[PDB]
Amino acid sequence: TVTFDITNISHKAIDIILKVVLGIAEHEGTEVTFHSERGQLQIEVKNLHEEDKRLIEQAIEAARLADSPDPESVARAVELLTKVAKASTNTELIQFIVKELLELARKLTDPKDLAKVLDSISELLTELALKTGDPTAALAAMVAHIAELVVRLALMAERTHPGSEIVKKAVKLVQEVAE
Amino acid sequence: TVTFDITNISHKAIDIILKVVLGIAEHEGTEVTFHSERGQLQIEVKNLHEEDKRLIEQAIEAARLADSPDPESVARAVELLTKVAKASTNTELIQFIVKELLELARKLTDPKDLAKVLDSISELLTELALKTGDPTAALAAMVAHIAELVVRLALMAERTHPGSEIVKKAVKLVQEVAEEVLEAAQLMLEKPNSDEVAKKLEEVAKKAIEACIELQQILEAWAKERGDQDLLREVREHKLQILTIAVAYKAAQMGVTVLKHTHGWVVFLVILGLHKQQAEQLLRFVHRVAHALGVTLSITFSGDIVVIAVTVGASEEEKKEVRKIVKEIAKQLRHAETEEEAKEIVQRVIEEWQEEG
């Protein structure tokens, strides 16, 4: 048997947790036991594989970050949850945490963070063009590549000026592209 | 002949009578002789049976009341009309009466009297739901008894502190519960087995449980102000029961069987024979309805069987005992072939849990 746990994680975020752990338990003859305290949650699991123990762990870190005020924690949250997206094999977990990704996308303001979000969106799209099955989705690979070139340019939005109205315009039109 | 008299009933009530009396009389081709004026009426019917005559007389006692202003007469009226609704053979003849109950509900503006509307609604839906064969026969009771908690709670709240003005919240809440359910019953009559009837008889619960919950918290406030350990024990248990109802209401929409128990500070449940995605479809509801209340709980599952239990105010070792129980229940259910075995198995755990002392 394997055991795992959290404290303080917000009632906003825990629906993502809940969706992951049950979702994994349905596979490969695995089973779970589970306790809740309106401020604490605990997981116990039958014969979990360590790569899935990482998946659950990684989701738990992202859930710790998800409801935080800190932009770097938001940026990191998108990164880690995007690792959860490309790790996740079921369609609905993606269908859900991308919705959260969009709710996170409007938070950001800072070039490298937004750039890593666009880069994470490149991971999402590069999975999604394959996860949609049939080859007519290949357009999204070009969109993702355009996002890459956007972020390669976005380095200049940090480097070239001390936060002028021109680089603010650049960030905001880029944020529109992200949304 | 039988020969009624319908003296002094008003225009709308004659419209009820002439429909129900023909709608009953026609089945055996019977002779009828109405006579009518400004403000008076009388009837004969040839060869109408005693057990049929009492349906007409009950419709007449409703008709002789249905234009009263008095809330208590309205309370009797909804009961009488409910009896007529149970006894009636044709569902459109039920539609033709149950629509008037919407006026009774919207007219009524005291919670202690709304008691009877929120009561009678249960029976009103119950007979139609059982006769049409949908799982809606529970969902009517599930909402109605959850609403009756609000009636009970309102009564004891006002009895705890006279002039409890906040009850105006409850009045509007339970009124909208009544309006929503009565119209959902109208849709269920019009569109039996339909996906829109499934969507409405799903939706009612969402507003219902929220409406239940607030008055539980308001009694929890009055109980905190009074401090009586007996009243505290009563209100906390009046919390616990709400979850015990709603879990059925959601399981029922899947066709899933549920079994439940209650002892002191603990609620126990099993939700049998559950496939794939549905454990989220269950828990994503069966979490929040708990998290709303300040409850503490234990959850476990093993392929197509799920086991849950709930408590308030227990020690860590009592909670551990609940964990022991549910984990044991899950393991001991796994090999069982039928729900008749499950019933014995959970009963065995609960009897042995008491026998260890």
Place this chain on the structure above:
Amino acid sequence: TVTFDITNISHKAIDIILKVVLGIAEHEGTEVTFHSERGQLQIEVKNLHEEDKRLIEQAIEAARLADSPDPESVARAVELLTKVAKASTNTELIQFIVKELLELARKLTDPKDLAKVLDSISELLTELALKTGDPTAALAAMVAHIAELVVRLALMAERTHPGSEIVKKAVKLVQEVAEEVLEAAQLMLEKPNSDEVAKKLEEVAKKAIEACIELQQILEAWAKERGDQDLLREVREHKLQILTIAVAYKAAQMGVTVLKHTHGWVVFLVILGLHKQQAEQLLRFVHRVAHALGVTLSITFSGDIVVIAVTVGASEEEKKEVRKIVKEIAKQLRHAETEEEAKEIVQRVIEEWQEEG
């Protein structure tokens, strides 16, 4: 008015028509008048409709034939009497019609003459689902497609030589399968949705499949004596069809849905949503019919879904291809949700298998 002039009916037919006419009057209160002088009869009625008249007319056309010994007249009788059973609604009238099919059916000595007797039974079993709400009743009609197949299964022999000792065995078998099914129909009408009829249905079902199975091997012997590759194609397909239908019988009793497909040298099934503790019954029954026929088959059992496929036999490459397709069917199903997704994705892999040709 409506009038009619029935002649030469015996007391039996008089009792039938007397039940039918007052059985029609019961909804309407119509002034019947019979008249009678033994050997001859008349009726008048008022206020009957043209479709009612056609129910009476077809009832009396059965009645003025049901005296007669000729198998062709029996073939008409058994065609007509089920129409009376479709059209009417009083359960005892259905029984008092259906009880005559029983004493008609036993008469017939020749397989092509009992053709319609078996069809009529298959029609009645189709009616039992409508009359009782249990799909296991029409499921017995899926078994009763064998009762149609029986005509083919004799006919192939008769179109080369008539009346062999094996054809004589066939009529006794299929008569017995008729007799027990018409009894099981009788018990279903007398006490619908019950464990005694469920048992005596199964008790003939296990014989019905055997009766088909024995007929295949005489077709097979006849076909290998003929040596024609097209007749050999006909018998392999008529073999494969048995399992294809009969497997549904235990599947839909267990409450699981079924899906199936055919491509001339292969047959596919998937059966879905099994609660695990009972699946070995479906499998054990799938094994019996399989080994009885001498087919090759492939199975995969994964979570709550089971895939089966069957063949006359092919190269080891075609065999391992079929095994691959079966595994892909399981793999692509196991984390889908709906019966619709099954319909789609099974069709899709069959299409993806065929479009590379």
Place this chain on the structure above:
Amino acid sequence: TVTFDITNISHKAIDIILKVVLGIAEHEGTEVTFHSERGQLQIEVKNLHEEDKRLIEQAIEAARLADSPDPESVARAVELLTKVAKASTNTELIQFIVKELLELARKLTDPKDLAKVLDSISELLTELALKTGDPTAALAAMVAHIAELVVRLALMAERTHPGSEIVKKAVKLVQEVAE
């Protein structure tokens, strides 16, 4: 994956195979894949555990011995099948083995084989006491030990007596007791 073959099957034996080779994964839904073709049968499985591989192995010996005419192979078949009963987890399965153990019991004759059956049914009853929890199954084991004493004694009788109708009668009375 794990995999096994059965060849030169007896069609009469197959259900004793069938109910365990399905049955082991039935607790959790682990994939079993299965092919059969009129006297040949093959099974393949995901992550099957060591003692469960031995459960299958023992069964697929037993179903090859189950209708062999050689008496020592029948004694072995009792030993194996009774080890299948020792390995039992389910409650219905054992019924299907015991009805075969009856069909074996009445075709035994010789003292060593008799000892294997008496001893192994004593085991079956001791296992059945652990499965049922009732002291009357402990009584049944005591009666099987009374028989065991008769069998430890019969193994003296078969080499002290010169062979006679008296010792034939005795072993036949003992066999009747065993049934």
